[PDB]
């Protein structure tokens, strides 16, 4: 549901209001090198939202999205079986 640039909007809502610019902090880098999961934190005055992503890119983006809509809110046991009606679709 993050259709656009959430952190551009985040900086927008912050420093229209003469609020301090959003600070970004890279907290943890966990996992194997081929599956590293990165943790970016965003702090804006007393509010801080967490960002998890497979890359620092998407982690920071999602952290800023959390900051952004938080700024607005607060002003099996079984593999599923497959049907047999499958066909060979031409490509």
């Amino acid at each position: 549901k993050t259709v656009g640039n959430p952190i551009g909007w985040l900086q927008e809502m912050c420093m229209q209001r003469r609020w301090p610019p959003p600070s970004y902090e890279t907290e943890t880098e966990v996992g194997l090198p081929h599956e590293r999961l990165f943790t970016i934190a965003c702090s804006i005055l007393n509010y801080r939202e967490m960002g998890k992503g497979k890359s620092k890119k998407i982690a920071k983006r999602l952290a800023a999205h959390r900051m952004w809509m938080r700024l607005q809110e607060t002003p099996i046991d079984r593999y599923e079986q497959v049907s047999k009606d499958f066909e060979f679709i031409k490509i």
Binding site: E80, Q81, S83, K84
Partner: protein
């Protein structure tokens, strides 16, 4: 998953879905067993109060010269009586005896 053709022997007018299985599944009906096994594949059963059928499997061999000697356990072989809902099985117009 067993797509082999089979032969229908008799149809049971008195029988109908939602009827209790005669052996080992008295608490299990044909209708609910069919759902619990292939509901995502069949969706639903239509014509629920009509008759059903009884089918028997055909041999897959094509050479009948040598005697098929073995301990078949004929009673155990006949134990698995197969009762099928008609509209869930594809029906040929081909006679079975032929």
């Amino acid at each position: 998953n067993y797509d082999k053709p089979m032969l229908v022997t008799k149809v049971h007018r008195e029988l109908t879905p939602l009827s209790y299985m005669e052996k080992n599944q008295q608490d299990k009906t044909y209708y609910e067993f069919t759902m619990s096994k292939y509901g995502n594949r069949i969706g639903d059963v239509v014509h629920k109060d009509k008759f059903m059928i009884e089918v028997r499997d055909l041999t897959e061999q094509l050479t009948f010269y040598v005697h098929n000697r073995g301990k078949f356990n004929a009673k155990s072989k006949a134990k698995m009586k197969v009762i099928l809902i008609p509209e869930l099985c594809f029906n040929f117009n081909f006679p079975g005896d032929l």
